[PDB]
Design a binder for these strands. Structure first.
Ligand SMILES: [Mg+2]
Ligand SMILES: [Mg+2]
Lengths: 456, 56, 456
DNA sequence: TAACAGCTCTAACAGGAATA
RNA sequence: AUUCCUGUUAGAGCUGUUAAC
């Protein structure tokens, strides 16, 4: 009775890179081959701009210089790869801004920060951008710096400065790479350089890497929510992200609102149907009208009867729907035996119940070790000694745990904002949660949809 | 008349009830409405005379 | 035989304002709803500085002071609405410049006024404003005042004072709104106040209004030229402009030189394909890299056989190129009968022959007039008794007069420098002409592209 | 509708760095 | 907020099971 169903370890998903080469290590492949989207010239050159107070601009130009020159990894050398220099590794020059492409924040921002007013501080930071907006064509990415003296307005109740800035500059189409003092004072340098460089390339152009072995006929959907603590009650702001590989070479990753008020994170019949309608209409527009054949709707909470009925009735019979729920905190945890020195291989899925499975999005990864090749690497070794798996509670499917598990595993590796090897959750869930935070901070965003490069 | 009282009235005597459904249920059945039909017709009409790509 | 093809009256295009409240009449919509960028709060407060001889300094204060007070129109009262002041109408405070920002024209300028040296006067004015180079963050718009005593150097053969000043100041990236005695002289105060208020708000970085429901996938190119009277021959300066709408909410308007020497205003294969490739890259940079699905080109003269092929070879198959030539001088003119008491409706386009149409850019507009409501308004009733229809000659568009006619009609309404209802030409043509003058005066501008807010 | 049980989530903080 | 998710402190949201009203 102690013998469970046999598991199968899904191998490490391959990532499409420069010249359609595949390598499961993102940074190693980027150094070796280059970005997938560099095959075409979406970014001609990464022209930057600075927005910071006059005192701390030297930090911005210093960090840009550090991006220009190669760096070596000091911490987590088990996984990271030596930086080859932005021009060498992304095959595109990184242009330092000239005098007019380099703005100065108003001194009134300091007064507002001393006053402890987050809303007015974000408004003033945005209003400082007019000098660059007269030259919006000149630059591609704006590096907004915030001095530590503004910490009092960085994060407090009912507010978040980063989300407010992102929601204020998203309709203005300019990507923004916010830099705090943390990126400056992080012990290691190759960490910050790799993260900032991949973010800069994604926000100026896009697609640093693309997941291979992706059927063009599947659209993956992830719903996630956030809470705004009202004085009387609460507001549950839920938003949905969508990923798919279209007929064109440009892999698409978008997010959107879901509309009024919600008291619970469970969508009703009409709201679920409307969101799903918007989703497959977006897919059809990106697929010249072709119907999706596989749909994956990942939700952090269980689908009610209304949500499943809305899913069933929104599509036609030809498009099978894979309604799956992702559980983050679970009691179970495993230990590999042959007992192994390193924890269980990443990607092992263990069918517990006919509808509930354990997926090991965390765990040892093979073939991505730089030093002592052949040794396994545990991404979260610093944080945890063992990997905590997630629970997939399939609410609607025809058959095959492998089909959804491999899709989730491949969706855990295409977060360009993530410096590390993978993510505990699929990019759909994480982007839906990020956009949920953004919408909760700024409710007047429900009108439009946005690409990933805006909010990553 | 509040909706709940209407539901109770309908449930009390549901064996004798004609229904009347005109062009309102079709909105939710996945088929175009009257306004959608009008806009489709306008699209064909405009694309036809003024020679413009239909799918563009 | 006296029967012509049925004319079609294109409706008056709508303009987008704050909270996306559409209106045909720009100033009335500004009064009722405010600037388009008011929702984004992009300009925030507007901070402006002065640069004039001290003997006229007070005048500037006066007009600026009178910018902050209501004004009631006395001339063209049939069109102009009551002015409410910068604080009320634009929902934005007008900032009194401090003594540190306020500058005085250096004395030697007055002396060179006697010498009649335009280049020396312009350079001396630039050196006078050089005290404002370091304090670029403090102010947004500079208000250069040229006294009537300098009229000797205002305009003379081969030199334009305002053109030279703006050509010198644009590479330094600081807008100026040159003010002469005309703005003070001019009887109707509300007219000038609307003009200066809109000009200053747009020069700060805001957008007073935008084309309602404008397609973001169409780019409207416009090429114009200017004459430099060389000693031996002639010089033709050709420059292009773009008025496309980026994926964001705001919209762009940028002009650039088409470039070594030209004796004819017809771009060759190489030059035309180069300027169109630069335009294509400019459009790609804003829309993440998406092709323009349709391109409009407005040239003042006919397209050559080589020039059409040059325009074609610069784009892919998906792009639709509608080459259009705009002719202002025609023997035709229209009379409206039902004999209408007011001239022929604006936007009434008459297809004369295959690839030749008559557009009435000038004409009566319904519902715009303020006094005597419900009556047509003729903007140019002061100058001409009847409107002069311009003529479109098509060279490349596969089909459809409506697309080009509506596009041009809407384009003649987004000239912020213009304080009247519309223009005679699309903003592409007029801004290409203005930048052609700027480049012809100053040859050292050909390298860089510039926004409309500098030269407007 | 008022408690009570479990399952699971986010909301604020804090926090150190890949088998030693 | 270059990143990662490990914990702490709380509250909700769902399910229920009773007592009702
Ligand atoms: Mg980022
Ligand atoms: Mg002007």
């Amino acid at each position: 009775l102690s013998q469970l169903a046999a598991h199968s370890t899904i191998p490490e998903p391959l990532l499409l890179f420069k010249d359609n080469r595949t390598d499961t290590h993102p940074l190693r492949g980027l150094s070796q081959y280059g970005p997938y989207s560099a095959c075409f010239n979406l970014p001609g050159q990464v022209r930057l701009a600075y927005l910071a107070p006059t005192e701390h601009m030297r930090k911005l130009d210093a960090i840009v210089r550090e991006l220009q020159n190669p760096a070596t990894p000091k911490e987590a050398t088990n996984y990271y790869v030596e930086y080859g220099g932005f021009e060498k590794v992304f095959k595109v020059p990184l242009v330092m801004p000239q005098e007019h492409l380099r703005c100065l924040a108003l001194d009134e921002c300091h007064g507002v920060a001393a006053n402890g007013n987050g809303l007015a501080l974000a408004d003033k930071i945005v209003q400082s951008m007019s000098g660059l907006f007269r030259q919006k064509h000149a630059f591609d990415v704006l590096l907004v710096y915030l001095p530590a003296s503004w910490k009092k307005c960085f994060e407090y109740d009912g507010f978040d400065l980063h989300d407010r800035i992102k929601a204020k500059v998203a309709p203005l189409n300019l990507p923004i790479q916010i830099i705090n003092d943390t990126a400056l004072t992080r012990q290691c340098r190759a960490n910050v350089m790799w993260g900032v460089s991949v973010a800069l390339y994604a926000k100026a152009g896009g697609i640093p890497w693309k997941l291979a072995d992706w059927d063009k006929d599947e659209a993956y959907i992830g719903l996630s929510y956030a809470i705004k603590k009202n004085a009387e009650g609460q507001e549950y702001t839920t938003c949905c992200s969508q990923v798919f590989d279209p007929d064109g070479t440009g892999f698409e990753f978008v997010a959107y609102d879901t509309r009024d008020r919600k008291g619970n994170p469970y969508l009703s019949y009409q709201e679920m149907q409307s969101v799903l309608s918007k989703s497959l209409h977006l897919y059809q527009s990106s697929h010249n009208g072709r119907m999706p054949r596989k749909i994956f709707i990942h939700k952090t909470t269980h689908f009610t009867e209304d949500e499943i009925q809305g899913a069933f009735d929104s599509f036609s019979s030809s498009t099978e729907i894979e309604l799956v729920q992702i559980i983050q905190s679970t009691n179970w945890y495993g230990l590999k035996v042959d007992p192994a020195s390193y924890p269980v291989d990443r990607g092992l899925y263990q069918p517990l119940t006919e509808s509930e499975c354990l997926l090991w999005t965390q765990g040892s990864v093979m073939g991505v070790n730089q030093q002592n090749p052949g040794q396994p690497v545990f991404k979260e070794a610093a944080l945890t000694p063992l990997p905590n798996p997630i629970m997939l509670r399939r609410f609607s499917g025809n058959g095959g745990w492998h089909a959804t598990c491999s899709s989730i595993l491949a969706l855990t590796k295409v977060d360009w904002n993530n410096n590390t090897l993978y993510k505990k959750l699929p990019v759909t869930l994480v982007y839906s949660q990020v956009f949920a935070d953004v919408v909760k901070q700024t409710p007047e965003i429900v009108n439009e949809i946005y690409d990933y490069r805006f909010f990553m | 008349l509040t909706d709940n009282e209407f539901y109770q009235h309908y449930l009390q005597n549901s064996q004798h009830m004609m229904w009347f459904l005109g062009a309102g249920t079709s909105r939710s059945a996945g088929l175009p409405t009257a306004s959608d039909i009008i806009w489709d017709l306008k699209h064909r009409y405009y694309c036809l005379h003024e020679n413009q790509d239909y799918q563009k």
